[model samples]
Target: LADLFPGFGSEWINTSSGRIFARVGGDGPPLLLLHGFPQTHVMWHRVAPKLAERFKVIVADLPGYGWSDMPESDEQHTPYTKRAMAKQLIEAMEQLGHVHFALAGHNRGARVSYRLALDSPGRLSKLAVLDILPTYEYWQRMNRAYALKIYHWSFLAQPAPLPENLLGGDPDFYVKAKLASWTRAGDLSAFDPRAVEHYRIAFADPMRRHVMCEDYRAGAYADFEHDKIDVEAGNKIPVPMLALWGASGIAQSTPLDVWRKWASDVQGAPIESGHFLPEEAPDQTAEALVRFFSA
Candidate 1:
C-alpha cells in the first residue's frame, strides 16, 4: 500500500460513520479526492504524485470501502446516501484542518461531491467530477441502451443477500470482470496488479460487499430524490465545476449540457481513455486537474 502512494502518510480520522481512512501528501492548497464504486483511494496512485506537485493532495476511501469502516445502515440505506457520505467526508476534511478545499470525485464519489456542493455551497473552492452524469440524469434516462450500459446500478442495488451471496462467491473474478469491462481496453491492462488486489480483498468481505449494495440502494432512492428536489428548485452548484468523461466511457449524454443544468459555471472535455481516466490517462487527467484547480 505504501509502495503505491509514495511519500504519503496514512491517517484514520473519526467521522460520524466511523474511522475514515485517508492518505495525505504534498504541500499547497488542499485538494480532496474520492474514489468510485468497486474501487478505493488506490485508484489515485497514478495521478496523485503529479497532482501533489501543485496542491496538497488528500485521497480517502469512502465509507464501506477499502480500509474505511462500514457503518451500520438502515431501511433507507441513509448511511450510504450521497448526502450522508458527503457529510462524513466533510468531517474528515475538517479533521485534516481543511474547512474548505478543492474536490475531484469519480463515479459514486462524484455524486457525493455534487451533493456537497449543493448542501454546503461555500465548502468547495471548485469541483470536478469524472465520468458521470448527475444521479437524477442517470435515473431519468434509464432507457434501453442506457439501462443495459449500467446494469450494475440495478443489480447491485437489489435486496441484500442476493448480490452479496452471488458477488461473494467469486469476489476476485467479480472485481476483475467489472474493472476490465469498464476500461476502454476491455481488459485489466490499464490497472496495476496491486490496486486490483485491494479491490478484490474488499469484495471478498461479505459485510463490505453488502455495503457496496447499500451504496447503490442509496443512489437509486435517497440520492436520486435529493437530485430531484434540487432540479425542481433549479438549484445550481455555486462553485466552478469541471466535468471530464472518457470518450468511450459510460456517460453517453452530452455531459456539458447536462451539467449546465445543475451548475451555473461548467466546462469540460473528453479524455482519450475510458471510465478510469486517472488510471488509464494519468498524465492528461493530472494536467487537466492541475490547470483547473490552480486557475
Candidate 2:
C-alpha cells in the first residue's frame, strides 16, 4: 500500500472498545484525518502523500467501518458517538505518545472532529471540518428537499433490523449505489478501484451493517442532544478553524455566519467539486490545508 500511495501504511491496534485499523506516516506536525460513513481511511488515499510532505498524517477507519471490530451492542460501544469517538481518537494519540496535533475530518469524520474540538479543546492545535453541519442544525433544519437528496440519512436512521437487513443484502450494491449517487458524471472513475473495494468489505457483514445503521440512528437522536448542549453552552471550536465544502454539494449551503457563533476565528471557501472534496480536488484541497495549517 505504501508503494501505491507513498507514506501510507496500516497498523492494527487494540483500543478500549476493540481492535482498530489505522494508517500512519508522514514527517511534520501530527495531523489526524477521519473519514465519512460507508467509507474507510482509504478515502484519503489520493490526498495523504501531498499533505504528508509537511505533516505527519494519520488516518484511521472508525470502529466497525473498516478493519476495526464492531461491538454487538450500543452500550458496549461508547466511542461510536461523535464526542465519544473523538475521545477514543485522542486516547489513541496519547497511546502513540502524541501530546498535541491538528485535526481534519470529512463527512462523519468531520462531525466527530467537530466534537473533538469541543470535548478536548487543548488537544487539537488546529481544526478543519469538511462537508457537514452540526448534528442538531441538520436535524432541526431538515426539509423535504434535504430528505430527497440524501435519502439514506433518514432511511438508515430508521429502527434497526429493517435497514440492516435491507441494505446489507448485497453489500456491493449499496457501495456502488452510494458512490454513484454521491458523485457527478464521470467522477467515479477518478478513485482507485481497490480503495472503493476496501469500503465495500465493511458492509459485507451483517454486524457491520447494524453498526453503520446505529451510527446514523445515533445522529438522529443522541448526537443531536449532545450538539444541542454544546451549542447552548457556547462551546465553539477554539482552534484556528478551516471549513471547506463542495460547491456542488450540500455543504455549500452551510451558513458561514452561523459558524461564528461557535468558532471565533473561521475561514472557509467552496471548491468546485462533488461531496468528496479531497479526492475530487486534491491540489486545491492540499493548498488550502497547507496554507491554513501553516498559518
Candidate 3:
C-alpha cells in the first residue's frame, strides 16, 4: 500500500500519546495528506503520487487508525480528540523539518487538519477539506434526514463498549458496510481492491476498532465543544482554504456556503464521486488539490 509513493521513505515518530506512522516522498514545497476513518495512508495511493510531481507529499496514518499507536482514552476521550491527534501530526511534521506546509485531509482527517490550521495558524500555508462540514456545524443541523445518512456518527459516539462491542462483533462486516455505503455506484467501481484490503487489515486490529469508536466519541463531544468555543471566539481558519465534497455524498451542494462561514478566504465545489474523494475520484481530487495548493 505504501509503494504508491514511487520513491517515498517511511518512518515512525514517537508522540506524547503514541507513535505516528508516515511516509514522505517527492521534492518541492511540503504538502501533508491525512486519511479518514477506517482507513490508513493507503487512502491517498491514487492521489498522492500525482500530487508528488508538484509538491513534496507526506502521507500519514492518523494515530490509532493504522500502524500508529492506540493510546487509551481519558474520561473525556481526550486521547482520541482531533486536537491531540493534530498535535501529534504537527509535532511530527516539524520534526521532519517542515514548519509550514499545505495540508489536506478527508473525513476524520479533515477534522484534525482543520483544527491544526486553527490552533497552530502558522503551521499551514494552505488548507483543503474533502467531504465534510466542521464537526460542530454538522451536529448543529442534525435532523432525521442528515442523521439517516450519518447514523454511524451517533452510533459510534455512544458510550464505550456499546458501539465497540457491536462493531467488533463482526468488524469486517461493519467496515465493508461503511466503505460501500459512503460512495455512489461510480465510486464503488473506482475504489482499488488493494486499498480495500489495506482498510480491512487495519480494522482487523481490535484496538483500531476501539480507537475509531473513541475518535467518534471525541467528535460527538470534545471535538464539538472545541469547535463551539472556536466559533464563539471569532477564530476562523486563518489560511487560504479550499473545500471539496463528493457530488452525491452527505456534504453535497453546500461546501462553499458552509465553508465560507468557517474560513475567511474559502472556495469549494464538488468532486466527481462520493465521500472517498481520493479513492473514488483520484485524478479529479488530486487535480483540485494541486490547483488549490499551487495557487
Top lDDT model: 1
Q: Poorest 10 consecutive residues of model 2 by lDDT?
A: 1-10
By TM-score, highest first, what's the ranking? 1, 3, 2
26: Cα error in model 3, Å? 0.5
Query: Compared with the true structure, what per-residue lDDT tens digits does model 2 show for residues 8-94?
Result: 777776667677678888888999888987788888877788888899888888766777777655643345778777777777777
**For model 2, what is the C-alpha lDDT against the true structure?**
0.78
| lDDT of each candidate versus the true structure | 0.91, 0.78, 0.86
Ranking of all predicted structures according to lDDT, beginning with the best and ending with the worst: 1, 3, 2
- Which segments of candidate 1 are over 4 A away from where they belong? none
The TM-score, computed over Cα atoms with residue i paired to residue i, of candidate 1 is 0.98
Residue 242, candidate 3: C-alpha displacement in angstroms: 0.5
TM-score of each: 0.98, 0.93, 0.96
Error of 3 at 153 (Å): 0.7
